[PDB]
């Protein structure tokens, strides 16, 4: 914006008296006012420093992988949501392992997943609506419990102001196909799927509905949102053999 | 700051006649206005209370032990990290483990340590520089990987305005020398160490580097933070025998 | 007005972490600030508490009992007033004895008149008039003074702002029926009038006119004021006998 | 607080060329400003200056001496009020003329008293509690007339800010050791006594209250406080003899 | 000021239709603004109507009469006060008497001396100086105690902003030619002197003195302020004979 | 709203002096300050009134007559309007006389009606949709010539913010049942159609569109909107005989 | 303006208690605001202190002598200017002395001539134009050199806002008919010119043009002005012989 | 001021996630506006850069060297000026040399004068007066010219704020004692002297008077103001013989 930075106006020197431009010294004026006022408020600054707030995770640290998995319209009652995903725990884990392996390799570098993310976004399909999206989930239950494809509205979620909403699936519970730091290691679905413990019991189950008063026709992306952390050296990539 | 507190004015009587201070009376007027102010923003602030902020750790509940356990220089250049710490497991838990103990013996007191903190402090060696820290961390890795003294700076965390950045180690991963409410009972590091299930894997790999695009020299202080709640009782210390 | 006092907002505690409601925090910063403020206008108020007004008699301390005189109209001609009323001192003493003593009794508690107003209360009896009243009056004169009864106007007392003017009579001149803190005796009027020293010298005179430019019709009411402090014991009242 | 007073800036002369500081320029223009404005607003201050203020008695002309005469501590149940001092019209002239001429003799100038004043000062004996402090008294009574020692609250005083109460004891009532402006002579109890006209009728009966919901204990100080002013004469005090 | 009251603007009608000048309709907005403001405000002043300020005694009610008396030039050293005057009670009463009689006969209408006041108007006798005056009094001694000349400044009053003050001199003391509503008798001094009680006991002894660190020279104009209030009855006069 | 209307305050009268509700004289300051505002922006105010605004016809002089004449529903493709009436001139001269006269008589007093406008008034039939309405019209045509029944948008009438938009029909194209102020006579269609010149050319013919970029259901309720002055004596009715 | 001066409202005493108007009340709290403000501001002040500006050299000391020379009307070009004066340096020296000596004698006190300015004052020769002036000069050239009637614009001077230029012409260049602080003395044109050293080297040039893009008319005055300082002893002027 | 700089709060990490302190991003979000704001004002700021102001002299480059010579007391006259110094030329030159030599030797470092000021400061002797000072000068003058003692006050030079006014005195006109950038040589008054041209010609004459209009007592201190740069090699001082 600024287009001359903080260096306006000059100075020179005229019989040994020395001049410098007007506009530069009434800014030294405002700057000195307003720095009278920064210290005045210094001690308000410090009770709001009792508390603090959280930096947004996909805008901070660690880098954003967006592996997105299908997509689906569903027609929607008033008051109502409708199942969004009904998989197993196996299918749940073969999509998360086959997509992010299948885009992410070669991996070149250590690394590590800070964090797993269940991403809804959703969108109008029909323009001069207006209405705002709801969300409901669970993450666990009996391999032979089946989820009701429809449920009434109790005590949602309502999804944020772009309309995305992302759910995070902790390490607790959903298993990474990177654990820790590492390098990457031979490694194959059946390998990655007998290693968890509880295959079969942990899988989203998500729901989408509206605020609307009538049915709404609802477009839907889901993706998993992978936050990661890599540990690139400070060297060449040479082609073999080295010097 | 106020020197009268609110007890500003006075009143007397003259003939049955009540008289009252005119700056007094002048401020329950203001004090009038102010009020049917804050009548007209508390449904404002009934919107605001759908949300919560986080107290400050630091400056919140429970006392501060700053165990600090080393010093070190390193010199960054521009757009790369360095590695501060490259201790194994075992070396990490001595230091936890010996510093603490060493330091706080004899405890008196029933206590329990609410949260364990790593503790990075920065400051520049060079006057007149103008540039801010960043930080990336790892928090476990195969023992035999040995962490690269020097990555690629991509995606860090800023350290924030003071120049501390301060990480939470978890009791799921990092053992504490009190575990739960209790008092102490005879203890050495082999006993500690030997029921820690996992004591090569977790540690703390911590890097360091600016948004400077020269090389800067730095100073790090490096501590562990013990987060801690005593329950004193409220009784007297007597000299043997009591009473 | 206020429906949640100033007790907005709550906390919860997560994982050690203490969380408050945002609007409570920022309440707390904005009241900060106010204080910064009544810090530095504290100086200025101490400026203000050099001089002191006036409690308004009528909503201050003691009891108001209007003991309703009578009612008149007058038609009043611009630039004039014309005289509400022209009892002898006699005449005067007998209305306020009669009608006080005959309102209050029975005089069951300890008490003393404070003050004894003259209240002249006035009212248009036309609509769509603009003006507003005015007054002038005498206490006292020779018993064989009788009043004009239209003058013109001098610069006369401006009635206030809801048409009511309130003269005091000062026990120096005019004869209460209750003379200090007491209880009420056995009592007469030829008593009471017996002990007046001067009974026909004391009378108000008074008289009310308007700023119209055109005569006006006028309704009056005329009532005497008590202002009255009571000294009831913390006791029972019992039927008898007692206990 | 300004330490420069308005001499802020300088001038000085360059080949016949007269130079002042620029601040001082600015503070010309802005005065010349603000009296635009004071001129503008004298027309409304001109309103207001139709009304008068009166001056704390306090605060303002001739001394204060203030008798401290005793103290005493009073429990006091919600919506009652406890009798401070019962005193005989002569007890009271005994502590008045007593208290005053010990603690003043020697009188070395000629002087008058102003006012005297009967001074209710309060405050709580326990901390964390909010409320207020209400007065009732009476001057007058019979001398076979006994006060309630506890009351109940009916349109009292509510005390001023800083929980003092003054009430004016008149001349016309009251005795003061000092009639009018003049040397003091020889004088004794009972002079002074003998010489008033109504001893046992004045004395006054205090009360004191609060505005709390609980009974409340509170500390009272009773003092008397005479405003005099003094005629000093502008000489010197010489060791006899003189010159 | 206002050059066309509020009756801007005008209206006319075209095919039915009715016009309005627009800035007519844009003051009927702002002045539906403003009075959704003043009911914002009542409750406010509601609080501020609890007390009363008291209408300056010389531009309220009554005619003022203002008899000078004498003018006298003063020299007061810093920090110390002269003496204005020193009558006897007997050439007090008659200058009083004697000035305002003279001055003010005929009176030809039924009138009453409300106040007289002491007035003491100061003034400088040299340019460029910058303080204010003080002022000190008393209004009776025994007769023969005779004023010091000049006194050390202890307390004074400060003399109001246009360097005029007004000593209300009561009734209770002060001898009145004209004491209540009356027609003026024959009259004389001596009937005068005669019928006053203490005529060498109230006198007005009045210091002057300033603010300043230098000695200053003063020209002080002492005058009787006499407030008045007449009954002249709304009647022509005419030649005699009358009709 | 405001519950004092503008008698804020009162006044009374102690020991001559007048003493002013401290509210009202602040109030009486303010309104000072507000008019020399006034006056410095009736200047201003002189430029706005160069130019005049029209008063809304339905809430302006005359009366109100809403004549319903149907309801009916369109779906409207985006960019075009449908056609929402179709008559011959006779038919809709038919539904002007026969609906007006059937809800009006017996019309008992003096009338003129002013002007006859043809109201369309539009809702929505789905909750949670956002657009607007538009309009466009013809009054007259070919009496062979039959109306499209759909056309494009094309530079329309944008419908005003309540959803209704009203049309005068001017009594130069189009016949009215009362013609100037006149008494009812007896009359029928099949006079009036006769005196009609035109009968069969004037018509209105409305399109109703919308904003939106979809196909939306619309509710039409069209009626005609007379407005009418009447001249009504200020007599009794009373049962015949008279008197 | 202020019709007052700082001396609104006025004092009295009241039964010892002194009175103040409320405006000067409300006004000297105002007065400790703005106070506390101006302290607020000193050290802001002091910033804009580092720097100085130069007073008007015609509205500062010394007095003004205008001493006009000749009128010209020249039509100047879009983008040129056009020579005003093309003396040579001796007609510049018989100008600049004679009219001077002229208009000025006798010179009757001792004076210095403190500087001497070429002013340029330009004004349109028609109306409803918009357009500025500008100016061009030169000081010094061979006395064979003859200027060009008309130049280019090329970075010329802007004419200040009141159409008036004035050049110093320095002393070092410039010969003036009064040197330093002197009393006059016989002395003629040939005695000034020969005591010159460079008489034909030093003569203003000076061009004038516009920003207009049209061709403008411009009347021209050019005049001498001369800033002196007079030292005038402060004695008497007697006609001879003196006493 | 400013106790935490702008270092203003913390962060810290929490499973990953980043928090901040809440004051401190609020401080982010108002630094953000009030750049947004320096942006909008950049364009204005620089149209005041078309102009410049001068640096004090004596807040400014260069050390200040104060001479000062004599003090004296004046009486002046309202509009007139008495004369502060009479000195020929040859005495101003030797207290010049004599005081600046005698004061400042030893000289030990290479430096210059820039500029020699006559600083003439001025105070009253007098409390409790109000008035500003005023100056006039001359610099040269026949050397049997001698200038009157006292003058009337002609557009005088009015004195700055700090009652200090500093005329230049330039090296055109006073010679010196030290010319250019130089160390010093061996040198004395007679050679200073003989090598001035003109030494009996130039020598300050100034008048100081006041804006009073009665007659004032003046202090006034002289004195001459050497600016002074030094070049002192950044070397050390050593004790004979070095190394």
Not at 156 to 166: K, L
Not at 224 to 235: G, N, Q, R, T
């Amino acid at each position: 914006s600024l287009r001359y930075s903080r260096h306006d106006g000059t100075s020179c020197v005229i019989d040994n008296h020395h001049l410098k431009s007007l506009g530069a010294v009434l800014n030294d004026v405002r700057r000195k006012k307003d720095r009278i006022r920064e210290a005045e408020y210094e001690p308000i600054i410090d009770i709001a420093d009792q508390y603090m707030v959280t930096e947004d995770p996909f805008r901070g640290p660690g880098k954003n992988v967006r592996i997105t998995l299908f997509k689906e319209i569903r027609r929607v009652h008033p008051d109502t949501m409708k199942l969004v995903c009904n998989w197993s725990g196996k299918e749940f884990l073969r999509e998360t392992w086959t997509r992010f392996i299948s885009e992410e390799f070669p991996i070149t570098t250590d690394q590590e997943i800070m964090d797993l993310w269940f991403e809804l976004q959703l969108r109008p399909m029909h323009p001069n609506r207006c209405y705002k999206f709801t969300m409901q989930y669970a993450l666990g239950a009996h391999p032979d419990y089946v989820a009701h494809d429809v449920i009434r509205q109790q005590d949602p979620y309502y999804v944020g102001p772009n309309n995305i909403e992302r759910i995070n699936l902790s390490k607790k519970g959903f298993a990474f196909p990177l654990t820790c730091l590492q390098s990457v290691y031979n490694d194959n679905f059946e390998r990655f799927f007998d290693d968890v413990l509880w295959p079969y019991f942990y899988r989203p189950l998500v729901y989408v509905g509206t605020t609307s008063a009538e049915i709404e026709e609802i477009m839907i992306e889901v993706s998993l949102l992978f936050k990661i952390k890599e540990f690139a050296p400070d060297v060449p990539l040479f082609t073999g053999p080295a010097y």
